[PDB]
């Protein structure tokens, strides 16, 4: 009995270039009380946490939000890479209470058009917050699902504590036949991990496709204060960035310059992808009988790691979760952080 990653995520390809559009749902089903405040108020906040983390782990992507009220699919934020605008729309959604029922087919019709401006390199994905037990299809919903699979638009849905075949078929059909995106939620923590697992890339089997060699730029900082200006918003910007090509001022952000249309990234977009592409092997709990390490931690100083000859305390476990290749022991609290935010293994690096 041990609950960790099985062997290792084989580092070959993961989806960093993406445009995931989550489709929320504000329906009278969400007026039914399942969560602590209600279905509607709670899910928004965990999507609010999802948005920042989604930008945190996939900063070269864009985000869009879709709501479903009164049997109609309604977008509140276009597919874009703006974290603050997405939250601002969700606040008004949070300010209001749900009514009606969700409309699956309209959202699927919305999803196809919405990700059409999404670039080829960005991996297509639409996230469905489907919680109710019925849809509203003004046509053949099997036709649009056939369009998304043919046009290579993978769909992962985040269902509530209910199981529907159409959503399961939708997940199976779009994701290259793979049926592994139908995890559902039953708790406050349970629904967040579905969002958190959507924050990370979702590889199952990458096919051989025509890969695109695309051109993107790196901006440069500014320092003027009294000459405060920017060519992106045309406001009193007391600090911003500049494209090396167009010389058109932009605020301090990864905002794409509106003059020559080349992608702008500072340091995070390349770096946040690098730790995603090649994950290390999980530091599994080294056996206490097979520890052969000193009574402390290695990455940090956690002297606690052995009860030693204390009945049901001794023969228990040990704070000695060691990395595989680096062969360095580490406490479970420490070794978890070793694979939580930054891999940065000490024994692996200290060589």
């Amino acid at each position: 009995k041990k609950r960790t990653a099985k062997k290792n995520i084989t580092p070959y390809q993961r989806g960093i270039i993406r445009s995931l559009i989550l489709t929320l749902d504000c329906s009278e089903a969400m007026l039914e009380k399942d969560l602590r405040p209600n279905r509607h108020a709670m899910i928004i906040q965990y999507a609010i946490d999802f948005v920042h983390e989604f930008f945190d782990q996939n900063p070269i992507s864009q985000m869009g939000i879709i709501i479903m009220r009164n049997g109609l699919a309604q977008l509140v934020s276009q597919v874009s890479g703006n974290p603050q605008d997405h939250i601002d729309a969700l606040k008004s959604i949070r300010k209001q209470e749900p009514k009606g029922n969700p409309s699956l087919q309209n959202a699927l019709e919305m999803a196809r058009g919405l990700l059409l401006p999404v670039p080829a390199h960005c991996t297509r994905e639409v996230l469905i917050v489907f919680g109710s037990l019925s849809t509203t299809d003004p046509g053949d919903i099997h036709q649009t699902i056939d369009s998304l699979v043919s046009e290579k638009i993978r769909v992962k849905v985040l269902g509530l504590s209910a199981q529907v075949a159409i959503c399961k078929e939708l997940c199976k059909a779009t994701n290259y036949g793979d049926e592994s995106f139908y995890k559902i939620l039953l708790d406050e923590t349970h629904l967040k991990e579905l969002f958190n697992e959507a924050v990370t890339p979702l590889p199952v089997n990458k096919i051989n496709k025509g890969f695109t060699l695309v051109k993107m730029g790196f901006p440069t900082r500014i320092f003027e204060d009294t000459p405060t200006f920017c060519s992106c918003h045309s406001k009193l910007v007391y600090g911003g960035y500049f494209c090396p090509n167009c010389h058109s001022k932009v605020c301090s952000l990864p905002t794409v310059c509106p003059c020559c249309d080349l992608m702008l990234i500072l340091s995070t977009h390349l770096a946040r992808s690098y730790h995603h592409l090649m994950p290390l092997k999980t530091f599994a709990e080294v056996p206490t009988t097979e520890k052969f390490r000193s009574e402390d931690c290695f990455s940090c100083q956690s002297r606690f790691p052995x009860x030693x000859x204390x009945x049901x305390x001794x023969x228990x476990x040990x704070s000695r979760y060691r990395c595989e290749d680096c062969k360095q022991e580490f406490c479970v609290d420490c070794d978890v952080f070793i694979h939580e935010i930054l891999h940065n293994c000490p024994g692996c690096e200290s060589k």
Partner: protein, 87 residues
């Protein structure tokens, strides 16, 4: 009729007072599932009971290790275990 395979699931609610006495007439596979704790429930509680059913059963709980006790994966656990059953 509501269940098709092993994967199939769903609540089968029955609403009558005398169903308390007819626990004997229920089939043993169904009757075993009807413990003494499911007698004379409240339907709103049964709504909660199916609310919990909808919360628990709908989860994609596929441990794949507890399957083999009653799923007997392909041509492996049948030859391995049923030879012990020929006693």
């Amino acid at each position: 009729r509501v269940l098709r395979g092993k994967d199939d699931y769903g609540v089968m609610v029955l609403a009558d007072r005398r169903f308390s006495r007819k626990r004997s007439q229920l089939p043993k596979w169904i009757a075993q599932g009807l413990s003494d704790a499911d007698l004379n429930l409240s339907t709103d509680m049964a709504i909660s009971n199916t609310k919990q059913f909808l919360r628990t059963m709908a989860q994609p709980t596929d441990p794949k290790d507890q399957e083999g006790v009653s799923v007997w994966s392909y041509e492996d656990l049948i030859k391995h275990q049923n030879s012990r059953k020929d006693q």
